[PDB]
Structure formats: structure tokens, C-alpha cells
Amino acid sequence: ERFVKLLDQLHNSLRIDLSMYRNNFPASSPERLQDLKSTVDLLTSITFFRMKVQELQSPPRASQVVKDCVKACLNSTYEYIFNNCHELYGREYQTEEQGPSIKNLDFWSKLITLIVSIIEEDKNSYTPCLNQFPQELNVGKISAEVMWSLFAQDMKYAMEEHDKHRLCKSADYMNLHFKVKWLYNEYVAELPTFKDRVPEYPAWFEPFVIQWLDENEEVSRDFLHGALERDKKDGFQQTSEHALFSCSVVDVFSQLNQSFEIIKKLECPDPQIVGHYMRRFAKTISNVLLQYADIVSKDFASYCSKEKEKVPCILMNNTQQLRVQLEKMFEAMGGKELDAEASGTLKELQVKLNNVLDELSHVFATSFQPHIEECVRQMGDILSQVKGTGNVPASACSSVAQDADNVLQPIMDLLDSNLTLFAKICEKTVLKRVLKELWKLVMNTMERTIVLPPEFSKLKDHMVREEAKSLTPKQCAVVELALDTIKQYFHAGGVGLKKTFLEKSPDLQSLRYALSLYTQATDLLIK
Amino acid sequence: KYWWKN
């Protein structure tokens, strides 16, 4: 009975020894590492003896006792490097009120480095040293778990404190978040305890990233007012041959993507948090791009109207390019899988940008409005001089076809050099928008110049509309043909508006109805 | 000529 207590004494004595294995058996000494191995051997033998002979329900066996001693050493080890962080770091690494500070994060970066040295030491030394129970005792594995867990407890508390006072640059919080992710993924993420993930660490830094985003938006919005002036001062030059937009466009999206790339490198493993960053950054993209549009749409006229006309086209191309490179970001932020409220704001942004390209195109087309009205009054005058010339030599006769050409000649001289210039320097959509707009403008002006309805006059008592003065048969025919020709002129054999669009154009239908009042001479009953 | 050929 005095033997069983003599054994317990010995078992306990070795427990004390191993509970400080690192300090008692330095990795520097190979022979001391051997002694450590001998010490574990002796412990198991004592345990094996007790389990075979005695039947005290078996206290460990061995592996669980050593494990608990190793966990102890780690708790002590963590305490050591926490209290001696500064000295340990500056002595081995490098390039007062020590311990955690609230004015700087330096202490935590140095602590991480020391933590790694410990884990690495337990992997490279000790683990091969203590190889008695490979299935059940991996010192390096258990070193990483304990060291991370002890570090996580302090880091969580530190960031809650930093949340209240802020005081450090957003950069410094951002980098620490990055360095922690590296530590977690390198040593912890593939551990049984943690494998199920949803790790807690990103939540510690969440308010610091949001702040960085808040600062980032105000930085981007600042970079905007600058990319545009640099472009405007350079005179919105087309970049290169097949890129119909200017430099301010590539500058903005490089800035937006660099910023997004920062969030991406965080590799946030908490989707709920990832949705938060995406929801916030989407607001940044919106406010930046909308500002680009709002900046341009507030200056568009001054470049347009009076020649030249290249710049207004490019400004529209730019605005279109915003639309295409947004969608490219939408996929980069993982479209469809993207947070709903985030994709919602971006899809509401594609609409706003679209409804700006339209507004812009309308302003541009209207810059031709006066000259068009002049060309249309000119073509109404020519039409009014259309006569039948029967009893007259066959060479002096002007045909319906020749007459229609003469009617359209003013407006064609106007548009020719233009349409031609566009299409050459507009994206398809930009060109189509301008043509659709110029189309509506020509049809409307024609409806309100050559074919204004008869006026009202007081008839007997109650103001009736007068009878329309019918065009002559030759006049009707010249109108019809000229009209049909403009349509083909805007179709342009498959570069202009589609024939389906022109036909169902409500502006063409109104002009045809207006025309119908005057064209009674040739209109068929029974069509 | 047609403005869309050149």
C-alpha cells in the first residue's frame, strides 16, 4: 500500500517535469531532447504497469496525460511570449508601456510572429521527439490549437476595445486582419475543432473594414474629380483605335477594382459578413459612377451643339462603357450568388446609367434641331414648287423620282457628313440611340412644317377646323417617295435602325396620318 | 453616295 503511493509520487513528479517540457528540455539540445523522450518512455511504462497489475480504472492512459502536460507548457509558453513580446522580437527579428497598446497595433503583429516560432518549434522539434502515440498525440497540432485559442481570446478583447476608441489608421487594422487570416489558414483551419469553419475572427475586424470602406469611398470620389479634369484638359481623347472611350473611364475602373481587390485578399470565410462588405462597396460603386455620369451630363451641352462633335460621341461611349464594365464587376463580385441587397443596388444602377445615356443622346440629337427645321422648311418649299409638266419636251420634264431627290437634298447634305462620322466613332448602342433620336426629330419636324393641319376658324358659331388644301397628285407621289426614301436612309442597309423599328415607329405613323389629310388625291379606298 | 459605305 506504501508502494502505490510511491508510484503516484513518481507519476506526479514526471507530470511536473513534462508540464514545462519546453523550458526543461530545450530544442537547442539534441541530448536534452533525448532525455525528454526517455522521460515519456518511463511515464508510459509506469502507466502500463498500473493498468496491467492494479485496476484503478486506469487514470489516463499515458497519451492523455502527456497531452495535458503539453497543453500546460503551452499555456505557460503563451504567458512567457506575451509578457516578453517586445524583447523577444527586437532581439531576433526587427529589420515603456509595453504589452497591448490602444495607440498602435505593433504588439499584436510581433506576438503573431512569436506564436508562429512556437508552433513551428513544436512541429519541427518535439513532435518527432514525442512519437510514442502518433494516432493520439501530435504536439505541433496541439501547439497550434492552444496557441491560437489563447491568442484569439486576447485578440477578440483587444479589437472590442479598439472598436470603442478607434485611434489607429484603418490601414493598420486592415493589415492585422490580413496577418491573422494568414495565421488561421496556415495553422488552424484544417484542425478537427475548426474544420467545420464559420470562424469567429473576421467578426472582430468587421467594423474596421467598414470604416476603411467608408474612407475608401471618399478617396475614390476624390480620385474621380481629377481623372476627369485630367481627361477634359487632354480633351477627351479616344484611347486607342478600337477603344471608343477616353482615359478617365479606364482610370475610374482601375481605382474601383484595386479597392475591390483589397476586400478580396481578406478571404473572409463568413458569408454573412462578406455580404456586408459587398452591400457597402456596391454603394461606393453607385455613388462613384453616378457621379461620373452626373459630372458629364452637367457639362455635355458645352462640348456639343456647336462643332466639334467627336467629344460628345466619346462622352456617350464613356457612359456606355460604364454600363459594360459595371456588369464585369457584377460578375467579379460573384453575380447571381451575390448578396441580394447588393445586386439590387447595382441592378438599380444599370437602370440609372441607361436612363442617362438616353438623356445624353437626346441632348446631342437636339443640337441639330435648328438646322433640321431649316432643312425641312427648305424641303416644304421645294415640294410646293412641284408641278405637272405634260405638254413640255421630254428632256425638260422633272420626274417624281428626280423631284423627291431634290426635296431630300437639303436634309441629306446635313446628315451625310454626320451619320458618317458617327457609326465610325460610336459604339453600336450609342449610334442606335442617336439615330433613333434623330429619326424622331426629322419625323416630328416634317409633321409640323410641310403638313401642319388646317387652322380653326369661327364657323357660324362654334369654331370648326377648316378643310385641308389637298396636295396635287404629283405632289402626293413626291411626298410618299421622299418619305419612303428617308426610311431606307435611316435603315442604311443594316447599320442604321432596323426596318421593323422604323415601320412600327409611332412618329412615322403620326406623320403618315397627318400626310393622309393632304394626300387624298392618290390614297386608295380599298387597300 | 450612301453615307454608310465608306
Residue bearing cell 462603357: A321
Contacts of A231 (CB under 8 A, 6+ apart): A237, A246, A247, A248, A251
* Rounded alpha-carbon distances, angstroms, from residue A435 to A19, A296, A362, A415, A492: 84, 21, 10, 10, 11
Rounded to the nearest 10°, the torsion over CA A295, A297, A299, A304 is: 150
Helical residues (DSSP H) of A125-246, grouped into ranges: 139-165, 170-183, 192-195, 201-233
CA-based R_g, chain A, Å: 41
How far apart CA A299 and CA A361 sit, in angstroms, is 14
Size of interface A-B (CB pairs under 8 A): 17
Residue (of A327, A414, A303, A315) closest to A356 by Cα position: A315
- Interface with B, mutate which of A414, A418, A420 (most B CBs under 10 A): A420
Q: What residues of chain B lie within 8 A of the CB of A488, using their CB?
A: none
Q: How far is B4 from chain A (nearest CA, A)?
A: 6
Ramachandran region, residue A357 (left: φ > 0; alpha: ψ -120 to 50; beta: rest): alpha
> Which residues sit directly before a break in chain B (C to N > 2.5 Å)?
none
* Rounded alpha-carbon distances, angstroms, from residue A89 to A73, A108, A432: 20, 11, 66
How far apart CA A393 and CA A71 sit, in angstroms, is 118
The grid cell for A65 is: 496525460
* Rounded alpha-carbon distances, angstroms, from residue A51 to A66, A378, A460: 16, 116, 128
How far apart CA A21 and CA A35 sit, in angstroms, is 10
- Resolution, angstroms, 1 dp: 2.8
**CB-CB contact of A43 with A14 (8 Å):** yes
Give the determination technique: X-ray
Q: How many CA atoms lie within 13 A of A417 on its CB side?
A: 8
List residues of A whose CB lies inside 8 A of any B CB.
Answer: 415-420, 423, 492-493, 495-496
How far apart CA A386 and CA A477 sit, in angstroms, is 10
Q: How far is B3 from chain A (nearest CA, A)?
A: 5
Q: How far is A264 from chain B (nearest CA, A)?
A: 47
The CA angle A34-A37-A43, to the nearest 5 degrees, is 145
Q: How many CB atoms lie within 10 A of CB A249?
A: 24
Q: What residues of chain B lie within 8 A of the CB of A495, using their CB?
A: 4
- Shortest CA distance from A496: residue in chain B: B4
Q: How many CA atoms lie within 13 A of B5 on its CB side?
A: 3
- Contact criterion met (CB < 8 Å) for B4 and A492: yes
